[PDB]
Design a protein around this ligand. Structure first.
Ligand code: NA
Ligand code: NA
Ligand SMILES: [Zn+2]
Ligand SMILES: [Zn+2]
Ligand SMILES: [Zn+2]
Ligand SMILES: [Zn+2]
Lengths: 162, 162
DNA sequence: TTGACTCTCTTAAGAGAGTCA
DNA sequence: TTGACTCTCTTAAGAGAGTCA
C-alpha cells in the first residue's frame, strides 16, 4: 500500500510465509565443469499455498493483503522489489529467477530487471564459465550450449555474400 | 504435392528476387573487442517489396507463388529451408537471423533451428568472444553484456539462505 | 496469378484483474 | 478477510490464413 511502512510490512509478512515453504536442495551446473548447490523455497503444487498466496496460472501466483479495508495484490515474485523503480530505460522491471525454478520464491534467488535481461540468463555460461552479468548468475543457464541447428546459412546460386 | 524440383524452382526464384534487394553494409561487433562487416539484403520498408513478397505484419512478410493453379505461401525467411526437416527434438524449426536484422533476407545470414536456439543468439558473446553454437554466430548478440539490473537478490530478515 | 492489404496464432520468460464461498 | 479458483494480457523472437480486384 501507499506508505513505506505499509510496504515494509508487506515485504516482512511475505518473507515470513515464504520462509516456511519447503526448502529443496538443487545441485546445479556453474559453468567451467563445476557444480554448486542452491536451496529453493518452493511454493506447494496445490492449495493451500500459504497465507496470502493464490494460483492464477499453471506456474503463476499472486500475493494479496487487506490494508485499510482495501485488497492489494501483486505478482508473487514481485514483492521483494516493491520499493524499487518499476521500470528501467522505459522497460518494465520483472522478477527474474536466478535459480531458473519458477516455484521458488527465495528472494536470494531473485533479481529485478528488464524482461530481456531476465530471458537472457537462460543462455548464460554461468558464474564459473564466463558470466558477465553485473548482478551475477547463480548457475549456468539451462539452455546454454551448442544448440541443435538443422540447417545453416546456404545459397543455391551466386547472388549473396556474407 | 510440389516436387523437389518445383521446390528448388521456388528457392531459385526467391533468391533471384532477394538478390536485387538493397544491399546494406553494416559494421558489427564480433566479440573480443573485434569488429566485422555484414552485408544485409534488406526488404523495402513499404510496398512494393519485390515479386512474390507481401507484408503480413509490421516486421513479418510472406512469399507467394502459384503453381499449377494452386496458391502456395511461406513465411518470407523460411524459403531457403524448404528442403530441410521442419522440426528437431519435438520443436518447430524457425528462421534465425544470424545478423539480427529482421528486414534482411540474405540466406547467408539465416539458419534453421528451434525458437529457443534462435532467441538465445541475442545474448551470444560472438564468434570472437566465445560462441559455442555449432552453427557459429556471425556476430555478438545485440543484448550481450552486463545488463541493467535494477535490484539484486536481497532479504530484510534472516529467513533465507542461498 | 499477382499485389497489398486484412486478421489471428506460437513460445516461454513474464504480468493484471474478476468470480465466488 | 482470506482462500481457491476463473479469465486475459506483455514481450520479442517467430508463424498461418482470408479478401478483393
Ligand atoms: Na528467468
Ligand atoms: Na533471432
Ligand atoms: Zn530458487
Ligand atoms: Zn550470467
Ligand atoms: Zn543480414
Ligand atoms: Zn553464438
Amino acid at each position: 500500500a501507499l506508505t513505506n511502512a505499509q510496504i515494509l510490512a508487506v515485504i516482512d509478512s511475505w518473507e515470513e510465509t515464504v520462509g516456511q515453504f519447503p526448502v529443496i536442495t538443487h545441485h546445479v551446473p556453474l559453468g567451467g565443469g563445476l557444480q554448486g548447490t542452491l536451496h529453493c523455497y518452493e511454493i506447494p503444487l496445490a492449495a493451500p499455498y500459504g497465507v496470502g498466496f493464490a494460483k492464477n496460472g499453471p506456474t503463476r501466483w499472486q500475493y494479496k493483503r487487506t490494508i485499510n479495508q482495501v485488497v492489494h495484490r501483486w505478482g508473487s515474485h514481485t514483492v521483494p522489489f516493491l520499493l524499487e523503480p518499476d521500470n528501467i530505460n522505459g522497460k518494465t522491471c520483472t522478477a527474474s529467477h536466478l535459480c531458473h525454478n519458477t516455484r521458488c520464491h527465495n528472494p536470494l534467488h531473485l533479481c529485478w530487471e528488464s524482461l530481456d535481461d531476465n530471458k537472457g540468463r537462460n543462455w548464460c555460461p554461468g558464474p564459473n564459465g564466463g558470466c558477465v552479468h553485473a548482478v551475477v548468475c547463480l548457475r549456468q543457464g539451462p539452455l546454454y550450449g551448442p544448440g541443435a541447428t538443422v540447417a545453416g546459412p546456404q545459397q543455391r546460386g551466386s547472388h549473396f555474400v556474407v
